Design an enzyme around this catalytic site. Structure first.
Site, PDB file in Angstrom:
ATOM      1  N   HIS A 102       0.729  -1.307   0.089  1.00 21.64           N
ATOM      2  CA  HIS A 102      -0.018   0.020  -0.071  1.00 21.64           C
ATOM      3  C   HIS A 102       0.965   1.295  -0.032  1.00 21.64           C
ATOM      4  O   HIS A 102       0.350   2.315  -0.307  1.00 21.64           O
ATOM      5  CB  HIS A 102      -0.767   0.068   1.388  1.00 21.64           C
ATOM      6  CG  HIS A 102      -1.994  -0.545   1.098  1.00 21.64           C
ATOM      7  ND1 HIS A 102      -3.120  -0.211   0.195  1.00 21.64           N
ATOM      8  CD2 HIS A 102      -2.781  -1.624   2.019  1.00 21.64           C
ATOM      9  CE1 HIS A 102      -4.168  -1.227   0.280  1.00 21.64           C
ATOM     10  NE2 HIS A 102      -3.861  -1.939   1.228  1.00 21.64           N
ATOM     11  N   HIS A 327      -9.235   9.884  -0.455  1.00 19.16           N
ATOM     12  CA  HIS A 327      -8.441   8.879  -0.478  1.00 19.16           C
ATOM     13  C   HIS A 327      -7.087   8.984   0.303  1.00 19.16           C
ATOM     14  O   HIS A 327      -6.369   8.000   0.515  1.00 19.16           O
ATOM     15  CB  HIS A 327      -7.886   8.357  -1.956  1.00 19.16           C
ATOM     16  CG  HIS A 327      -7.163   7.201  -2.331  1.00 19.16           C
ATOM     17  ND1 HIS A 327      -5.801   7.002  -2.095  1.00 19.16           N
ATOM     18  CD2 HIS A 327      -7.643   5.787  -2.300  1.00 19.16           C
ATOM     19  CE1 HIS A 327      -5.753   5.800  -2.314  1.00 19.16           C
ATOM     20  NE2 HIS A 327      -6.688   5.024  -2.261  1.00 19.16           N
TER      21      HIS A 327
HETATM   22  O1  LIG Z   1      -5.583   2.674  -2.885  1.00 13.95           O
HETATM   23  C1  LIG Z   1      -5.006   1.694  -2.420  1.00 13.95           C
HETATM   24  O2  LIG Z   1      -3.718   1.398  -2.089  1.00 13.95           O
HETATM   25  C2  LIG Z   1      -5.826   0.497  -1.704  1.00 13.95           C
HETATM   26  C3  LIG Z   1      -5.662  -0.705  -2.528  1.00 13.95           C
HETATM   27  C4  LIG Z   1      -6.620  -1.740  -1.996  1.00 13.95           C
HETATM   28  C5  LIG Z   1      -7.445  -1.629  -0.912  1.00 13.95           C
HETATM   29  O3  LIG Z   1      -8.475  -2.567  -0.623  1.00 13.95           O
HETATM   30  C6  LIG Z   1      -7.760  -0.289  -0.555  1.00 13.95           C
HETATM   31  C7  LIG Z   1      -7.020   0.717  -0.973  1.00 13.95           C
HETATM   32  C8  LIG Z   1      -7.167   2.376  -0.244  1.00 13.95           C
HETATM   33  O4  LIG Z   1      -6.100   2.780   0.289  1.00 13.95           O
HETATM   34  O5  LIG Z   1      -8.378   2.798  -0.217  1.00 13.95           O
END
Ligand SMILES: O=C(O)c1ccc(O)cc1C(=O)O
Length: 438
Positions: A102, A327
Site C-alpha cells: 500500500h 483517499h
Molecule cells: O489505494 C490503495 O492503495 C488501496 C488498495 C486496496 C484497497 O483494498 C484499499 C486501498 C485504499 O487505500 O483505499
C-alpha cells in the site's frame, strides 16, 4: 510553513482551493530539481499515464516501480512497462496471506540533491483528478561531500528509519536506493516516519512498525496534559477491514490504546471515525464511481454493524473539498474544543489490522500483513507544545497546522449508511445521472 503538507489539485473547485495544492506534474517538474532517477512505490499503476507526468526532458531517466502484484496482475504490470526500456520493477514480497503493498512514496534523485515524497495517491489519472489526497514533501536534501564523514541524521531519526523501512524489502534495487540515501544529508527533516512491513515482530522489534511504532513515538516525544482523557482521537480513512465481533476485540483494546498514548507515565476518550456515507459518494464530483476507491465490502460490514455508530460524514468546507471524496488517510489528537491538536499523521494505512498490526501469541507478537507508510507531525519536533488548527486550509502565524477537513466531525444521521462498494444503489441518481449496479 514548516509543515510541507499539501493536498492534490481537484478539477472543478474554484482556483482559491487549488492555490497551494499540487498536481503530480508539479511534483515532477524541473522547478523541483533536475531529475537523474526516481523510484515510485505504489499499489496501482497506469504506466502510460505515469510516464506522461514526467517532464518531456526527463521521460527516459530510470524509473523503478515498487509494487506487490503477483501472478497475472504481475504479468499485466510487466506488460505495461515493457515498451519503456528505462523502467525497472521490484516486486515487494508479501509472504503473509491477504497482504498488500500500500505504501505510496516517491524517491527523486536530482543533480542537486535528493527528495522524498510520501503521499496517498495511486499512480492513475482518477486518483489525482477529483479526490482529496495528501502529500508530504521533504526538503531538498544535499549530497554529503565525498571524504566527509557525518551522519546526515535528523533529530527525528528519519534517515535511519527510512533506510530501515527499505531494508525490510530485502530487494537489490532498493539497496541501490539505500546507498543513495546514505550519501545525502537528511538532517533538516522534522517529521517522524511510521511504517508497516509484513512480519511477526516480538521483543524490541515490536516497536518498529504499525501501531506499536506510533505508541513508542507518542510515549517518547509527546507530553500528557491535564484532562487528556477529554482529548478525542480522530481517524479518517478510505477503507475498513474486519475488526472483530465487537469493539473490545481490536478497535478499542489495542488500536485506540496506542492512539491515546501521550508521554511516559501510566478509557472514555471519544473516538471519531470519518468515512464517506452513501450520500457523500452520490453527491460527489465523481458520483457513484468514487465508491470504486472506497472498498468496504458488504461481507465485512455485516459482521461489524457495531462499528458504524462511530462513523462521521466526510466534510471539508475548510479546503473546498466536501465533494472530493477522500483517499487520504489521517489520524490526529485534537483538544476537546478541536482548536488544537497534540499530533497529526498522514499515511497510507486504512482502518485495518492488516495495515496497523494485531497482537498474537498472548500479546507478545505483532503481526502485520502489509506495507504502509506515513509521516507524523509532533509539536516537540517544531519547538511547540501543541499545534493550533488552521481555520481555513488555504488562508493566511505559520505555526498553525493545516487540517484538511472540518472539525468537529459530524455524526451520520439516522438515514445515513456507510458507503459499501459491492451492493447496488438505485434509489437516487448521482451527479452524472447514474445509479450504482456492481
Ligand atoms: O489505494 C490503495 O492503495 C488501496 C488498495 C486496496 C484497497 O483494498 C484499499 C486501498 C485504499 O487505500 O483505499
Amino acid at each position: 510553513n514548516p509543515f510541507q503538507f499539501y493536498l492534490t489539485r481537484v478539477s472543478g473547485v474554484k482556483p482559491k482551493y487549488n492555490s497551494g495544492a499540487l498536481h503530480i506534474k508539479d511534483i515532477l517538474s524541473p522547478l523541483f530539481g533536475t531529475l537523474v532517477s526516481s523510484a515510485q512505490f505504489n499499489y496501482c499503476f497506469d504506466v502510460d499515464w505515469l510516464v506522461k507526468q514526467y517532464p518531456p526532458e526527463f521521460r527516459k531517466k530510470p524509473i523503478l516501480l515498487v509494487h506487490g502484484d503477483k501472478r497475472e496482475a504481475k504479468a499485466h504490470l510487466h506488460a505495461q512497462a515493457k515498451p519503456y526500456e528505462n523502467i525497472s520493477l521490484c516486486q515487494a514480497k508479501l509472504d503473509i496471506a491477504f497482504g498488500t503493498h500500500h505504501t505510496k512514496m516517491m524517491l527523486l534523485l536530482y543533480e542537486e540533491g535528493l527528495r522524498v515524497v510520501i503521499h496517498t495517491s495511486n499512480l492513475i489519472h482518477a486518483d489525482w483528478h477529483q479526490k482529496t489526497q495528501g502529500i508530504w514533501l521533504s526538503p531538498l536534501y544535499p549530497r554529503i561531500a565525498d571524504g566527509t564523514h557525518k551522519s546526515g541524521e535528523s533529530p527525528t531519526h528519519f534517515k535511519a528509519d527510512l533506510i530501515s523501512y527499505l531494508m525490510a524489502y530485502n530487494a537489490p534495487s532498493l539497496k541501490e536506493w539505500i546507498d543513495v540515501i546514505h550519501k545525502h544529508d537528511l538532517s533538516e527533516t522534522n517529521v517522524y516516519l511510521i511504517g508497516s512491513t509484513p512480519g511477526r515482530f516480538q521483543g524490541s522489534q515490536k516497536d518498529n512498525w504499525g501501531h506499536f511504532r506510533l505508541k513508542k513515538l507518542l510515549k517518547d516525544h509527546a507530553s500528557s496534559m491535564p484532562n487528556a482523557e477529554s482529548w478525542p482521537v480522530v481517524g479518517q480513512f478510505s477503507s475498513v477491514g474486519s475488526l472483530g465481533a465487537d469493539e473490545s476485540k481490536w478497535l478499542c483494546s489495542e488500536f485506540k490504546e496506542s492512539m491515546l498514548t501521550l508521554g511516559k507515565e501510566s478509557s472514555s476518550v471519544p473516538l471519531y471515525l470519518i468515512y464517506p456515507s452513501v450520500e457523500n459518494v452520490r453527491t460527489s464530483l465523481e458520483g457513484y464511481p468514487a465508491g470504486g476507491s472506497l472498498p468496504y465490502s458488504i461481507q465485512t460490514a455485516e459482521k461489524q454493524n457495531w462499528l458504524h455508530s462511530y462513523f462521521h460524514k466526510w466534510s471539508a468546507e475548510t479546503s473546498g473539498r466536501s465533494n472530493a471524496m477522500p483517499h487520504i488517510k489521517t489520524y490526529m489528537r485534537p483538544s476537546p474544543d478541536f482548536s488544537k491538536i497534540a499530533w497529526f499523521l498522514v499515511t497510507s494505512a486504512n482502518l485495518s489490522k492488516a495495515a496497523w498490526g494485531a497482537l498474537e501469541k498472548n500479546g507478545t507478537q505483532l503481526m502485520i500483513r502489509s506495507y504502509e507508510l506515513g509521516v507524523l507531525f509532533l509539536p516537540s519536533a517544531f519547538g511547540l507544545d501543541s499545534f493550533k488548527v488552521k481555520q481555513k486550509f488555504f488562508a493566511g502565524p505559520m505555526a498553525t497546522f493545516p487540517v484538511p477537513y472540518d472539525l468537529p466531525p459530524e455524526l451520520y444521521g439516522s438515514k445515513d449508511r456507510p458507503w459499501i462498494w459491492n451492493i447496488p444503489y438505485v434509489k437516487a441518481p448521482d451527479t452524472h445521472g447514474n445509479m450504482w449496479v456492481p
